[PDB]
Design a binder for this molecule. Structure first.
Ligand SMILES: OC[C@]1(O)OC[C@@H](O)[C@H](O)[C@@H]1O
Length: 393
């Protein structure tokens, strides 16, 4: 009596014409009507939590691979998908580093649908205009700073490197990119304790925020993040940001003339190369009255034919299926060589129910420094203390 309802969230929800085509094909094939709701990234967690707490909303929902599935599963909000995955042809094709991201107490509660890792996204034409070689992007923090300073011309609203400092996950991810590039870690290996209140973590915090505050190579970091910077990049106003394969269809939609005029590279680093893992899974709420049809939709959406067509048309994000990654023409593109080589090393946000609260502490830490309310030393002390209380609660 309830129409099958899917909630699609995050940046990929902008590809609404592609989604409509995909869903219509499903309806034709299965004779099941689908109610679709699309959600922007920045408020999607709060909306999804609101619904799951109430026992209402979707039969199938997007959930971030960055800790949401363990958080929801711990509460009993999600239907287990072990039995379905055991019987599904596709299971052995999902990149294996993705299964821990949707696992709670050795049970899988989500089906990874797209994935990514984070990289330097940069604008070739802007490098060239500044007298830099586009095909030789910065490899180190020192080179990143030099290139960012050389490109920046704030008087003409031109910026070398966009720093995310909003109260959004992008800011945590930005800090993590620099933390791991400095040879630090977010939590201890057993997740019991904060690990970022270290000399490495301080160095990362100071450089990430200095790019915005001292060196002034970013638009206002308190107001803007990765997705804003990608759109500015399409206008040739921001030369470098953190991004990845989801960025590709989106930047090309914003400015079709930018095709071929942007690329990706391993993000510049200090002590160690770093990348962070991301993406979205499909989950079925335990309160759904339509659980079997919801699985049928998940199965269809994560099928070979659907993902082959998606990649053919849109060129991103990265399929969670190995066979599509390997059999599609993605590998012909140099952008994708870099992605496939980096992905297996990408570090994961901790797959624990505490993660969203922890991310909130990292966001606040960065913001308070950017706002001049706290020194990096003061901010990182407080954040780590709060994370340890969260983990001990
Ligand atoms: O694909 C980009 C993305 O949606 O950005 C936000 C992250 O939290 C997600 O995991 C994903 O990487």
């Amino acid at each position: 009596s309830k129409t099958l309802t899917i909630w699609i969230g995050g940046q990929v929800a902008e590809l609404d014409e592609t989604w409509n085509s995909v869903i219509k094909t499903f309806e034709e094939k299965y004779g099941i009507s689908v109610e679709v709701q699309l959600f922007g990234f920045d408020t999607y967690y709060d909306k999804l939590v609101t619904a799951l707490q109430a026992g209402k909303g979707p039969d199938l929902a997007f959930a971030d691979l960055g800790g949401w599935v363990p958080t929801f599963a711990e509460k009993g909000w999600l239907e287990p998908m072990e039995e379905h995955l055991k019987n599904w042809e596709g299971t052995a094709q999902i990149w294996p580093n993705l299964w821990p991201t949707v696992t709670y107490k050795k049970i899988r509660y989500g089906l990874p649908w797209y994935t990514d890792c984070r990289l330097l996204l940069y604008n070739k034409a802007m490098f060239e205009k500044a007298g830099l070689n586009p095909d030789n992007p910065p490899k180190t923090w020192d080179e990143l700073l030099d290139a960012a300073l050389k490109i920046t011309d704030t008087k003409n609203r031109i910026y070398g490197y966009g720093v995310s400092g909003t109260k959004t996950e992008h800011t945590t991810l930005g800090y993590m990119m620099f933390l791991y590039a400095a040879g630090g870690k977010l939590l201890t290996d057993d997740y019991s304790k904060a690990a970022f209140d270290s000399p490495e973590g301080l160095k990362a915090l100071k450089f990430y925020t200095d790019l915005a505050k001292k060196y002034n190579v970013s638009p206002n970091a308190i107001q803007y993040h990765e997705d804003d910077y990608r759109n500015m990049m399409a206008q040739n106003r921001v030369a470098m940001a953190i991004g990845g394969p989801w960025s590709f269809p989106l930047i090309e939609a914003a400015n079709p003339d930018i095709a071929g005029k942007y690329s990706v590279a391993l993000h510049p680093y200090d002590a160690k190369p770093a990348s962070v893992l991301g993406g979205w899974a499909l989950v079925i709420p335990s309160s759904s009255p339509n659980k079997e049809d919801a699985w049928k939709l998940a199965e269809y959406l994560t099928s070979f034919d659907v993902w082959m067509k998606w990649v053919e048309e849109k060129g991103g994000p990265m399929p969670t299926r190995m066979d599509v990654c390997k059999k599609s023409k993605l590998a012909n593109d140099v952008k994708w060589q870099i992605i496939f080589e980096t992905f297996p090393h990408a570090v994961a946000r901790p797959p624990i129910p505490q993660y969203p609260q922890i991310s909130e502490q990292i966001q606040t830490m960065v913001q308070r420094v950017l706002l001049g309310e706290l020194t990096p030393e003061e901010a990182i002390k407080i954040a780590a203390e709060n994370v340890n209380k969260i983990l001990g609660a």
